[PDB]
Structure formats: C-alpha cells, structure tokens
Assembly symmetry: C2
Homo-oligomer: 565 residues x 2
C-alpha cells in the first residue's frame, strides 16, 4: 500500500431548495437578514473546488427531494436536473426519497444520472426499484482502492415515509460493520460511509464499528462549523468534523453540511499506507449572497444597508474563509430559470375542489361560541389538523392552534398557490410520543393562554382527537369535560391517561410558543422522542387535496366549547 490523499466535497438534505432562502446572522454586531444557498451556488462552488483540489470525491448524503414546489410540481425532475449538472460521484438514499412511494422514487431515479448507493435498503426482484442502486462502489486513487458504502435511516423511513413492502431494510450498525468487514480481504483499508442515518446514529457507528474512516452524514440537518461561523451566530452544533476512536483505536471522522443547499463541506483527508485517516483541510463553506443585507430600523422595518455601513458589512464577509459570496453556475442558472418559469405556470393549476359551506377561520372564529364567532369556532383549523393527521400512518392525533389559520376556507377551486396562501408561516410537522395525561394537559395549557393569559390564536383544534370543555374552570382548575381519540377500528374511544400516543403538531407550538407549556417541556427531552419531520404545512395541505380532489367541507371542528354565560 501507498499513502494517498482525498478531497471530499459534500452536501446533504437539500430538500428541493433550488433557490436561495433567507436566514439571519449577527454581522458587525447587528442582526442582519441575508440570502443563503440555492443550487446555482452549490454547483458553482463544487465546480471551482473540485478543479482546485487533488482527488476530489463529490457526494450527496440524501433527501434530495421534498420541501418546496420544485418537488411537488416536477416529481423530482428538477432536482435530478440540478444534481446531474453538479456531476456528483455518489448519492445515497434518504428517508424522504420514499415519501411518494416506490413510484415517486422511480420518478427521481429515472432522470438522475448520479450513481446511487444504499447497502441497507434492498429491493426484492419484483420491485420496480430492483437494480436501481448498489450497496457500495470501489474507486482507485493513485493505484489505491477506496470503498464507499451507502446507508439509510431505518425506522424513520419505514414509519414516517412510504416505502413499498418489496423493499427490505436492515439495521444501520450491523450493515455498516458487515459491509466494512467483507471489504477487508479485498485489500481495502480505506472506507467511506455515505450515511443518511443521522448524526446520532453515525456517531454511534463511529464508536462501535471498525474499519470505517469517514462518515459523511445526512438527516439531522446539523451545521458543523467553526469559530468563524459561531461569530456570525449561525446555529453551529458541532465542530467540522467530529473525531472519534473506533473499538480498534483507529480515528473516525464524522460530518454533516447543514441543509437546504446552504453549505458545501470541504474535508481534505490523507490516508497512511495502512489506511489511517488524518485531516489536512477542513472548511464548511456557507454559500451567501452579497445582495441582501437588511437590518431592522427604529420604526421596526427591515431595510438594506447603505454607504459605509454596507461597505463594512461586505468587507467583513469577504474576509472570512468559511463564507463564499455570490457563487453562480451558468448551466445551473439556465436550468433554474426554466424551472422557475414552469413552476409559476404549474402552481396556478387546481389541486382540488371544495364543495359545501365555508369553513370559518381567522381571528373572528378562533374560539367557539364567542361574540363574532360561530358555534363550531375555527372549522378551518380542524381542516388544517386533518391535513397534518394525513401525513403519517403512525400518528394517533394532531393538534393545531387557531392562530395558524388566517381566514375562512371558502368553497371552490384550490390551487397549489392557494395552499401557500392558506398557510404563510412555514411550519413543519413535529411529533412527540406522550401519555394521554400530557395530551389533556397541553389542551388545558392552550385554552388557558387563549382565554386568559395571551393570544386567542392559541385555541386548540385537533384531528383524531375531539373534546368538550367549559370556559369556566372547575374546582380542580380544569376546563376539560371529555376527551376522545379515534381508534386508527375507526371507532372513537375515551383517551387513556396512561397510553402513549404519537402526537403531531406544528413546529411553532411544539417549542412551547402560544402558551403550549407541555410541548415546551417535552422539547429536547429524549423520553418523548421529539422529531421535526421536515414535512412543510402547505405541502401537507396540497397532499390532502390530492387525496380529496372533490372534498365536501367539514361542518364541525372536533371541539364543543361551553362559553361562560
């Protein structure tokens, strides 16, 4: 064996973010709105870095698809096009690759020309996905063999996505070890794992599995960063990269590249003849525009910097190694212009039709049986809760706050654009696994905030759960009268205080906003298994209409609220 060097360049979890998106940083001491990401910047940066560095290896760690209308309106073809233009060496399957079933994955893979790897996701012969990817590949650098193994997250995909029954999944840790062990006798001592298992599982693999040198990560969406990125108050979770020892005592490196086309990770690796990795270069490149630099003025308005203040802002960004400004790729620009124009036409098409009476929503209807409201209150909120309930086969009930719906939902045609109009906040679906007693408590919390302590927008409505409550609390301080949960037997049953339910809600109240105290306490406590699904609210609404293209409006809100009189 001889020593060799590799230049790993990687992204993950772009989730159909073909265009840039807004974020906030602390620049020269002030909170500043800026634009980051987009696939034109990704491809431009990959193209420039791969020509600059010896032995580049260009990787995508999964969840190419789902998250914007660029997926929904094109079935993956837009994502395939921009990925092809980046000339990635390998792509591994994520969890969202299965969101539209085997059928949906096939539609991505057909136009995609990037080699696909996944060692623990294995289709049977009759599957439409048979022979569409391989478990590993071996490439040669300066005479040396290097293996790369693909890997997906298991439970999350099986439970929260929609793979077909003819696709078999295998344990992440076992697959990683068995794959690496088999490669040894082929004279291979340099092994890369391209894994959508998430940071937590990949860190476990690093510490429990031998013979794997680098684990390029997706699924967790973590920014692995450095002091430069910390100085901008970006959400840095870990240093780029993390380092462990495996049971044999050899170093293992683990790193992710944030999400949503925001970062190109850049890791230079030298391997000893015996295949031990060391780091020669480590840069998480944040892709940023120079054109939006907005700060909040004294009237509360976000305004562009001007004059010397703008110059100082630009100078600071230009001086940073980990910020890359205004990268753009001509080919990718052409593709995105084409898809953007098509998207604007397609988004005006009808996804479904609603018949019947208007479903009351907005501020006036937040609380049932109040002046200016109606006896059912915000039926539109129940509707939104139903769109959330429809996402996951595993979910027992969902809860949505009335303030998350800004107007009545009226009968007539519903377009893709309309869904984004109905739901302007950009929430994703978030789940907890929680006892019935806590479900009762969060409803109590929300009603208390809505009626007494805060905004009426906190008032809760659910799908798969229905309740009666009094405005006036009883002797024990409780407003709830009855709570039922739908047996997914299809009969309504009394909630069970001791049963652990899988509960879905929006990301906003999941963190405890709007007085949802109970959710606030469950957040980050692993006992409750909290997870951000990254399924956007407007997209959930679109799926619901696709399922009910001729939907008869609900006439009840799953809430009976006895107002004080």
């Amino acid at each position: 064996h001889k020593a060799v060097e590799l230049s790993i360049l990687h992204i993950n979890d772009h989730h159909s973010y073909l265009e840039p998106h807004e974020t906030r940083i602390n620049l020269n001491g002030q909170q500043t709105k800026v634009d980051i990401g987009g696939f034109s910047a990704v491809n431009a940066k990959l193209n420039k870095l791969r020509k600059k560095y010896k032995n580049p290896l260009v990787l995508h760690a999964g969840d190419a698809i789902t998250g914007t209308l660029y997926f929904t309106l094109f079935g993956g073809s837009a994502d395939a096009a921009v990925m092809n233009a980046g000339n990635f060496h390998y792509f591994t399957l994520g969890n969202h690759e299965f969101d539209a079933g085997n059928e949906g994955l096939l539609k991505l893979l057909e136009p995609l020309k990037i080699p696909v790897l996944s060692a623990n996701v294995i289709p049977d012969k009759s599957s439409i996905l048979y022979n569409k990817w391989k478990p590993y590949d071996i490439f040669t650098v300066d005479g040396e063999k290097i293996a790369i193994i693909g890997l997906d997250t298991v439970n999350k995909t099986v439970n929260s996505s929609s793979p077909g029954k003819d696709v078999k999944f295998y344990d992440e840790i076992a697959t990683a070890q068995i794959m690496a062990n088999a490669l040894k006798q082929q004279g291979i001592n340099k092994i890369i794992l391209l894994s959508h298992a998430g940071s937590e599982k990949n860190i476990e693999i690093a510490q429990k599995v031998n013979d794997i040198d680098v684990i390029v990560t997706g699924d967790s969406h973590y920014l692995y960063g450095n002091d430069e990125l910390r100085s901008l108050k970006l959400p840095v979770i870990y240093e780029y990269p993390l380092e462990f020892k495996n049971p044999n005592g050899e170093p293992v490196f683990v790193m992710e590249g944030w999400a949503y086309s925001a970062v190109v990770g850049d890791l230079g690796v030298k391997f000893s003849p015996e295949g031990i990795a060391s780091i020669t270069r480590k840069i998480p490149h944040v892709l940023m525009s120079s054109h939006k630099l907005q700060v909040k003025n004294s009237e509360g308005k976000w305004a562009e910097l001007t004059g010397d203040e703008r110059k100082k802002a630009l100078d600071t960004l230009k001086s940073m190694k980990s910020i890359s400004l205004d990268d753009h790729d001509a080919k990718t620009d052409k593709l995105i212009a084409k898809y953007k124009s098509e998207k604007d036409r397609l988004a005006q098409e009808i996804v479904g039709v609603i018949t019947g009476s208007a479903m009351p929503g907005g501020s006036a209807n937040r609380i049932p049986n109040k002046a200016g409201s109606n006896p059912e209150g915000s039926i539109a909120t129940r509707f939104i809760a139903e769109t959330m309930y429809n996402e996951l086969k595993t979910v027992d009930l969902t809860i949505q706050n009335a303030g998350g719906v800004r107007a009545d939902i009226l009968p007539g045609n519903v377009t893709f654009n309309d869904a984004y109009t109905f739901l302007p906040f950009g929430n994703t679906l978030y789940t907890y696994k929680m006892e019935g007693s806590l479900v009762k408590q969060v409803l109590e919390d929300a009603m208390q905030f809505a009626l007494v302590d805060g905004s009426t927008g906190a008032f809760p409505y659910g799908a798969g759960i229905r309740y009666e409550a009094n405005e006036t609390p009883n002797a024990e301080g409780k407003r709830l009268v009855s709570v039922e949960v739908l047996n997914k037997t299809q009969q309504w049953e009394p909630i069970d205080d001791n049963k652990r339910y899988l509960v879905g809600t929006n990301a906003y109240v999941a963190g405890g906003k709007d007085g949802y105290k109970t959710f606030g306490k469950l957040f980050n406590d692993p006992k409750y298994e909290g997870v951000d699904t990254y399924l956007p609210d407007a997209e959930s609404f679109i799926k619901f209409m696709k399922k009910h293209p001729h939907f008869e409006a609900y006439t009840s809100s799953n809430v009976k609220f006895n107002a004080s009189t």
Copy 2:
C-alpha cells in the same frame, strides 16, 4: 455465465467423537445394537466420494470440539489432526468452539490447517483471535465464481459458551443478507452458506433472505434422511435436503448431517447460468460397522447374531444405498491409535483432590432421614447439581435426581476416569425457562414419585436452590415447606412464583422420566425454550474439579426433609 455442477460433501457437530459409538436400529424387524461413525470412517468416505465426483466441495459446519475426552485431554489437537487428515475445504465456527474461551479456540485453530469462515463473529484488533478466519471465500469452478459465507449461532454462543468480550457477534439473518447482497456486483450468482445457526434459523434464512442457494447446517444435530433410513427406524427429522423459495421466488436447499461423526452428506447440485440450483444427487451416508450386530435374547441379554440370521442382517445393510459399511482410512487409523494410547495414559492423571468427609450417595442415601440413610441424604447429588450449575453463567438453579449418583463420593484424588465412573449414564445438561410456580411443582412431582409412586432415585437435590419439605403432604396435597433461590447479589431469597428462572437439569429427567411430570410437559413446548446443551455430565464434573483442584467436601445437601415419624 455458464452452467456448472458442484458435489457438496459435508459433516457437522462431530463433538470430538473420534471413535465410533453405539446406536440402535430396526434391522430385519428386530431392534439391533450397532456401531456407527468415527473419524476414520468419515475421512475414508470423504476421500472415496471426492475422487468419484466432479467438483467436490468438502465442508464442516461447526462444533468440531467438546463432547469426549478426546477434547479434554488434548485441547483440540486431536480434532485438528483428524480434520487436517480429511482435507476439508472449509470449517465454520460453532457455539462450542468458544466453550474454553478465546484461549481454547486459539488452541484448536493453531494446529488446524483447514480454512475457517465466520461472517457474523468478528474479533477486534487486540483479540488473540484477530485475523484467524475470514467472513467468506470465493472459488472458481470451470471459470465460474462461487462464494461461500460462514455463519454462527449468536445468542446460544454468547449466553451458553464463553467468547471473550473482544469478539463481536451480529444477527444471523442480517449478516446473511448483507453478505449475499454485497457479493452480487462482483458477478456472483452462486452462493453457499455454511451455517451453525441451527435448522430453525437456517430455514428462516431460506425463506426471508435472497441470493443464497444452499445452506449447509450445523447445531441442531438433526438427521436429514430418506425412506431407507426411516425403514431402519433411525431418528429422521426431515428429508435430505429440504427445499424452499426465497422472497424472490428462487429455490433454496437446506440440509444437516446428524452429529457425532455418524453421517457424510452428499448433495449434487447443478447451477443454471443465472445461478439457480437444482439437485442431481442426494444421499445421506450413514457410516456403520458390520462387526456389531446384537439383538436381545429371551434372558434379556444382548448377543451377536450368528449363522444365517447374521448373513441376512449383513445382506440387508449391504443392499442399502444410504448405509456405508466399514469405511476406514489408513492415515486416520494411525492418528487415532496414537491418540487412543495417549488418552489412556492422560485419563489416569489427577484433575483435583477432595478433602474432608465422604459425601453420601448411592441408593442408601437417596432420601434424607430414612433408615440406612443420613440426615442430609444424598450430598453427592448436591455436588453433581453444583457441577451442572457451574456450566452456564445464565442458569439460576439446577436440579439432579438422587438415582443419578450410584455411590458415596469419598475424599482423595479424582482422575478424569473417575468422573466417568461417578456418572455412567451419559446425560447432557438440558435447560428450561420456567416460572417459579413450575419449579415448585417439579419438586413436588419428584418427591411424590420417590416416596410413593416409583423409584427412590427420583428424589431431587439442587444447586442455587434449597428447600424444606415434609414426607406427609398437607391439606392441600403439598410437601414443600419453603423454597429459596440464590441471587446470582449472592444472597438467598424466597422463590418468586411469577419470575421466570433458567433451570438446568439432566436430559433423562428433562423428558419426564422418574416421574418428573412437569419437565415432561415443558418438553417440546417452545414457550419454555427447552434446549439440550450437549454438555456431557462427566465433563461437567471434570470442569468443576479443574475450578476446585483442592475442594473441601460439602456437608449439606440443600435439602431439609422432615420424615414422617
């Protein structure tokens, strides 16, 4: 690809049976004692068949070691010698390969020149077993590649044998699929699995895992046979071989070769260009001597057939395709003669010394506090129970019947031969996982048989369990007064009716003999997880003395029995 044929020749679970052993068959209508097996016959038959057939593949499916003094007195060197003389192509690790720790396995592997395979048993770098075997091998027949993958049983090895902590084990099904899946892209469509997982798990693999054509089995000790062997009333469990379809619809063949050097399995396989297996020859060869043909006469004595009756017996055996008479190999005969002579010397060596007072046993001492007995009864039986308790780290308590010990155990030197004198019945250790209430019941059963319904030899004594009982049953028909089990905290605690204990006993009473009704009912009911460990009783006694080379005799039997007066 081209079509190719393979001639698989295999044994399994020889368990150090270098010499023939006795069995009983139904020959010409009469029960007949005959000798079968031995490694001279194995090697002779393998040698003759491999020269007769094209493309022979000669395999050993594990548990080469443990079961006779040929292991104990030689540490595996005798087994290695006879295996080497058979020129096997591959050996896979079984469960008993770890009975004497990594240290014991190393002693087998050092002299062993047969390539070793095991894909789901993987030593860490610092292990003394590092790099002593490979997960798979690829060989070429007439230009075609065929892969062979090794596999071991997991839970049984980890729990009931003694592998070191630096040896990691992986799931049988996952390993089989991941290994086979990885081999595909190397242009391999013919795959053999050499698996000590046992028949049950191998049958599951055949039905749940793709891309594996033949599974050559060890661990279960099942005779896979045919109508010829059924006619002799041999213990045929399945047809040689079994056939399944995998999830992809392709055929999979599974077969074992009984145990204890008794059978050479002979399976001719043709593979299509696409790697689909079909059977061209299927013979389970039972290796039998022509020299012992004994039937029971009218005085109850076993006597050799003579004259025309002997001739008819021989003629019947000679006419059978699946019986092979008097195979012997010159080289192996020389090895066995050498080891047999050495064994006779070594077996007279001292394994331990007992000091103190005689431990009463035999018929006179079966029941405590009876005429001709002593207040403690059969302390020697408690001793034997302790030797059983010492075998498995997992076992909570053991129970031994007093009739299983034929004499007092006196102070002084104990040799290897002495252990086989102490314990002449040839039992192995058998376990059940059973509730405390059933433990109470089996003690009640045994006492009832000993005192009223049958032989006094049924009277039970235990290790890790102690009890008080009255000869006269109470109003509820029960003799037990108290039952305690040793917390493995090292404090005695009351038995818990609802706790499931791992209970060890001998194979004889495990089947319900001697009135052990409760064990009889647990037998073959999978709820109770019954398993024959194949750990022989005399060998357990030898291990105990090795652990206590200067053992002070027990003075109590773990039983307080209040005789009726």
